[PDB]
Specification:
The structure is a homodimer. With 130 residues, chain A is α+β, with helices and mostly antiparallel strands. Chain A has one domain: Nuclear Transport Factor 2, Chain: A. The first copy, chain A, has 3 helices and 6 strands. Chain A has a 6-stranded mixed sheet with strand order 2-1-6-5-4-3, with helices on one face. The first copy, chain A, starts with 8 loop residues before the first helix and ends with a strand. Chain A: This is DUF4440 domain-containing protein. Chain A: Keywords: Plasmid.
Chain lengths: 130, 128
Amino acid sequence: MLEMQINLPEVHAEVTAQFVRYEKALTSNDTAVLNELFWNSPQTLRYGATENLYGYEAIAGFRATRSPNNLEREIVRTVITTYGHDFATANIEFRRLSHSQLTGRQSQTWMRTSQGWRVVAAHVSLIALP
Amino acid sequence: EMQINLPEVHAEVTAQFVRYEKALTSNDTAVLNELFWNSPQTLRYGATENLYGYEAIAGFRATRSPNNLEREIVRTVITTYGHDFATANIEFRRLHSQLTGRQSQTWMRTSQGWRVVAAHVSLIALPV
């Protein structure tokens, strides 16, 4: 039963390590790693801060041309949850070292594929902090 | 090796997603709460607030306004993984301003049925 298999420590460790790689790649604009970690499927999607992208080829195309400026941020809060052995969500709140009056949220859903853990869908947005 | 969009699973999840959307438009708070995973781990990144845990999400729904306006759906992507997991992602326009809404959910099949384990909604300005 899946609800007796929330945050199994070995699975949670695995997902957390890949999430850490993703965050480091994001801040250094390591596009190879950012693409590696997204599920290579037409179903994968990314709702970015400024665009909606459908399918791995569109997301990888977008990362190729995106500017490496104003990427740095501090993570304020993190919740990674795993379900059984093969599925997880990763959610963070962040603040960009630049833009002062907004707080950022990033959400991912991760799946264990035959090539390792991959992001199947993601969503990033910034909202006004009261 | 998770099987994608198995037909029974994909139909089931789609039917619960439709229940959720109809409850949003009618402000049927009981159904909106029923469909969220009853766990401290559940979270909801709303258009204007971040809520952590079922009790906070349910409290927020119960006390908010009958405001949630109708949407025109631009695109819907519902994907299932094996028998017990899914994602539901929609792009929408509120029938209001010129913003483009995005709503993302992840669903799990619990012992009480399909539930939302995490969700995120945001509105952005896209060029026309």
